[PDB]
Paper text:
One central protein involved in the formation of regulatory ribonucleoprotein complexes (RNP) is the coronaviral structural protein nucleocapsid (N).
All crystal structures of nat_mutants with WT-like RNA-binding (nat_mutants P67S, A119S, E136D and P151S) superimpose well with the NTD WT with RMSD values between 0.592 and 1.776 Å. The effects are moderate and may be neglectable in the full-viral context, which is in line with earlier findings using P80R (and A119S) variants of N testing the infectiousness of virus-like SARS-CoV-2 particles, where no significant effect was observed.
Residue numbers in the entry: 48 to 171
Write the structure that this text describes.
Amino acid sequence: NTASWFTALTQHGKEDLKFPRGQGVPINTNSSPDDQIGYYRRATRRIRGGDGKMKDLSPRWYFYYLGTGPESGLPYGANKDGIIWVATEGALNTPKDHIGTRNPANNAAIVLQLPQGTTLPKGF
């Protein structure tokens, strides 16, 4: 019953998601400077293609605050395939259980917006 608070970054290229130190955290006016830390989780979807065979769709990366989402128990910097970490300078390395996850039944997803001067890899 839980989803990301933001819309996804679609991976159109061959390279995985990666942000330079300090960049990557989506803008949220309902959050404070201490909360600006989390991870992007890759979600690949498979569909029945025009030839009957299963084919992959462009991967989607969803942001979740630290201590929240499908990898709530993972600490910052944890090595896991499909998980990349982001944190703004000044955010505290503590769980963000007060923000948590979004319930789509009563909350719309916030359009993913990166701060001014955020660099994204090719195909994003």
